[PDB]
Amino acid sequence: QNRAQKLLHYLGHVMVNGPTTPIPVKASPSPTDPVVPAVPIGPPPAGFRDILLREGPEGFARAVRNHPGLLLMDTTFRDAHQSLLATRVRTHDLKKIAPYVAHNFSKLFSMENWGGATFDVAMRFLYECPWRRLQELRELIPNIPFQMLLRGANAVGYTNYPDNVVFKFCEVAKENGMDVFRVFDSLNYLPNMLLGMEAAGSAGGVVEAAISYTGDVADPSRTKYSLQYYMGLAEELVRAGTHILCIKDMAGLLKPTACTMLVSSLRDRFPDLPLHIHTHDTSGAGVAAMLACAQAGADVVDVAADSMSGMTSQPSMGALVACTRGTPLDTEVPMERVFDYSEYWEGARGLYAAFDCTATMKSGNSDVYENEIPGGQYTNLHFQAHSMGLGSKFKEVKKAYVEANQMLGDLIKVTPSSKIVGDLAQFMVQNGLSRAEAEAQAEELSFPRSVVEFLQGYIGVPHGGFPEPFRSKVLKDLPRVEGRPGASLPPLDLQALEKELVDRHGEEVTPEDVLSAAMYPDVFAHFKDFTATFGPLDSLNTRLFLQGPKIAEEFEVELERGKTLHIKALAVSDLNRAGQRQVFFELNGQLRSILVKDTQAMKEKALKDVKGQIGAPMPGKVIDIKVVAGAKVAKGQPLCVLSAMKMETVVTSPMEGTVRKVHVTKDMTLEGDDLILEIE
């Protein structure tokens, strides 16, 4: 096992240099481990995936539609922690209750557990493969359908990718256990959605086209995003051939009446079409809004475990289950199960204290109605203003966000569009530009990178258009994109990229990998180089992964299919000159030591002898500068007057000719052999 050494080299690197990942809150994990409820030994109860496998997506949508009562999709495994814990939740922790959900939550419509921020976060920060997580969870949950969030053309990154790679992404995702593809586009821009839909379509999965939601449909005066706007868009997507239709309320902007008005009317134009509604609780109106959707006849609602709900996450599962009983809406989910599911997560959440948004955010905020920052951005921007800075500098960010949105011509804000607005907001504050003042200077302002690419249409054409007098005098000489980006973008090779992955990262490279390097060339590179050094770490428990082991603590670890390793950290020595520390472990009762580098201690006048150069005769203060900086000298001619204490030295030179530069001027103490003069 060279790979026991690699494990140790990592654990030592942690407990010498501290939490190796960016650690946002100065907090450590819980000294307690999540409670995993007892599970039955057999196969689980039949869920919806048995229906999906037997009838296809067309059959499955019929089964969903016909289910009288309300169906839930749990988002704890993805969206919940994307908002609350900077997407930091690792496969280890998800695997622990996988058996539990299988057995106890067979009734769920699907179970959101992939896509969105999880894809890069897994590799970028957690140093684990997102395909491995999908695969492993699939062997653990045979019965419940899996669901992912797919950003239309921007697939799983933050811009439009070449047509072919988006199609291939869905094929291998499907092949891995991915059933339901929720497909959206930050600007409700049809072409990009059709593209996403036929990527998921022809891969065989359940297609769920998702309209992104902004403004207030209940508010008559706001014309831009009317009930008609949304109605015309669904009808397009239905014509395009979706299985389920989703309303993606990413900012938590959906209130009871607006739901009643919208879902009841969507139920009208589409009598038997499954409606899946997704909201965020950041205004405090999540639960109520969902019960409205229930009443207006929505088939599926998004919830999260209690301990992972409220604020910028989804609404509480416990609440929808409770407020739904004794009504035609009944979920038929036992409360005891919800309690226990949530209780595990209360404990798991505890491990992620370093990333818990709750450190500065203790409530929802109704001002989402004014600024419209989606759930995830809100909290991963709110943090930015109470942590690295302090307090109210977030106010102006929000005030600039409002202004930026209308500067870009009133936008639907989801990823990436939301990121664009937030980038222009940050920019305006970063150098004090008010909206109107930014407008007049846009001619030569030099804006962020994401904002200028947007106005070229790398991400597409928003409803309405580009706010005109602005767009033109930002670009002025830059290529625009007409219509859909993927149309001109040449099909990206996937076999000349295979050859490179064979080169840089040895022979054992799967096709899953290929698509990751396509998706995240440099994140994948830094990923594969880490797992080269420290081996695979997706098997450690999270406290050990983030914090390292405690001194004298005796702990257990197994490395994927290999036997158990009893370990104790014993001591970590002082610094050697190379800036390294020796770390001592009891491995299997056997004593072992590791050299590791101390970063905090890695970040830790001239003499010339055998040459024509002149060094100082004695260590002394310089009281006289004699030779004009770069002038002639003679046979034994004074150049410098030095004085330590009671001792002086008039510096002479037999060396004649020109002089180079003068090193020291006046005052400070000069060492023994130190820099004075060169002579040609």
Please enumerate, by residue number, every residue annotated as part of a binding site for Mn(2+): 79, 248, 278, 280
Does 171 contact Mn ion by CB under 5 A?
no
Does 362 contact a second copy by CB under 8 A?
yes
Does 347 contact a second copy by CB under 8 A?
yes
Q: What minimum distance in Å lies between the beta carbon of 250 and ligand BTI?
A: 8
* Run of H or E residues at 192: helix 190-201
Residue 475's φ and ψ, nearest 5 degrees, are: -85, -60
User: Among residue numbers 395 through 434, which ones bind ligand BTI (CB under 6 A)?
Assistant: 415-416, 418-419, 422
User: Among residue numbers 380 through 419, which ones bind a second copy (CB under 8 A)?
Assistant: 383-384, 387-392, 395, 419
Q: Which residue ranges are tagged as binding site for substrate?
A: 78-82, 151, 415
Question: Which of Mn ion, a second copy, ligand BTI, none does residue 416 bind (CB under 5 to 8 Å by kind)?
Answer: ligand BTI
Q: What minimum distance in Å lies between the beta carbon of 439 and ligand BTI?
A: 23
Does 598 contact Mn ion by CB under 5 A?
no
Whichever of 397 and 481 has its CB closer to a second copy, that residue is 397
Per-residue contact string for residues 72-101; x = within reach of Mn ion by CB under 5 A = -------x----------------------
User: Among residue numbers 293 through 312, which ones bind Mn ion (CB under 5 A)?
Assistant: none
Quote the Cα angle for 257-262-264, to 5°.
95
Q: Could you tell me how far CA 339 lies from the centroid of its own chain?
A: 29
Task: In whole angstroms, give the CA distance from residue 486 to residue 458.
Answer: 9
Answer yes or no: are the C-beta atoms of 514 and 498 closer than 8 Å: yes
Q: Which residue ranges are tagged as binding site?
A: 78-82, 151, 248, 278, 280, 415
Does 96 contact ligand BTI by CB under 6 A?
no
Whichever of 228 and 392 has its CB closer to a second copy, that residue is 392
Per-residue contact string for residues 638-667; x = within reach of Mn ion by CB under 5 A = ------------------------------
User: Among residue numbers 475 through 494, which ones bind a second copy (CB under 8 A)?
Assistant: 476-477
Does 456 contact a second copy by CB under 8 A?
no
Q: What minimum distance in Å lies between the beta carbon of 649 and a second copy?
A: 6
Whichever of 75 and 143 has its CB closer to a second copy, that residue is 75
Q: Structure tokens of 389?
A: 């800075």
Does 265 contact a second copy by CB under 8 A?
no
Size of the site for a second copy (CB under 8 A): 109
Answer yes or no: are the C-beta atoms of 678 and 622 closer than 8 Å: no
- Alpha-carbon dihedral sign for residues 370, 372, 376, 378: negative
Task: In whole angstroms, give the CA distance from residue 632 to residue 39.
Answer: 93
* CA-closest candidate to residue 82, choices 44, 114, 107: 114
Q: Structure tokens of 591?
A: 């004593």
**571-592 burial: b if 16+ Cβ within 10 Å, else e:** ebeeeeeeebbbbebebeeeee
Answer yes or no: are the C-beta atoms of 281 and 287 closer than 8 Å: yes
Answer yes or no: are the C-beta atoms of 673 and 617 closer than 8 Å: no
Q: How far apart are the first and last CA of the chain?
A: 62
Sequential DSSP letters for 586-621? ESSSSEEEEEEE-GGGT-------SSS-EE-SS-EE
Task: In whole angstroms, give the CA distance from residue 517 to residue 524.
Answer: 6
Instruction: Candidates 65-73, 310-318, 490-498, 510-518: pick the segment binding a second copy (CB under 8 A).
Output: 310-318
SS (H, E, C) 115-142: ECCHHHHHHHCCCCCHHHHHHHHHHHCC
Task: In whole angstroms, give the CA distance from residue 672 to residue 449.
Answer: 53
- What residues pair up with 146 in beta bridges, in sequence order? 111
Per-residue contact string for residues 137-166; x = within reach of a second copy by CB under 8 A = ---------------------x--------
Per-residue contact string for residues 584-623; x = within reach of a second copy by CB under 8 A = x------xxx-----------------------xxxx---
Answer yes or no: are the C-beta atoms of 341 and 362 closer than 8 Å: no
Per-residue contact string for residues 109-138; x = within reach of ligand BTI by CB under 6 A = --------x--xx--x--------------
Question: Which of Mn ion, ligand BTI, a second copy, none does residue 121 bind (CB under 5 to 8 Å by kind)?
Answer: ligand BTI
Does 582 contact a second copy by CB under 8 A?
yes
* Run of H or E residues at 285: none
Answer yes or no: are the C-beta atoms of 196 and 211 closer than 8 Å: no
Question: Which of Mn ion, ligand BTI, a second copy, none does residue 215 bind (CB under 5 to 8 Å by kind)?
Answer: none
CB atoms inside a 10 Å sphere around CB 543? 19
Answer yes or no: are the C-beta atoms of 301 and 277 closer than 8 Å: yes
Does 310 contact a second copy by CB under 8 A?
yes
Q: What minimum distance in Å lies between the beta carbon of 200 and ligand BTI?
A: 19
Whichever of 129 and 420 has its CB closer to a second copy, that residue is 420
Question: Which of ligand BTI, a second copy, Mn ion, none does residue 317 bind (CB under 5 to 8 Å by kind)?
Answer: a second copy
Task: In whole angstroms, give the CA distance from residue 173 to residue 170.
Answer: 5
Instruction: Candidates 280-288, 347-355, 371-379, 457-465: pick the segment binding ligand BTI (CB under 6 A).
Output: 371-379
Summarize as ranges the residues that interact with ligand BTI (CB under 6 A): 117, 120-121, 124, 374, 376-377, 380, 415-416, 418-419, 422, 646
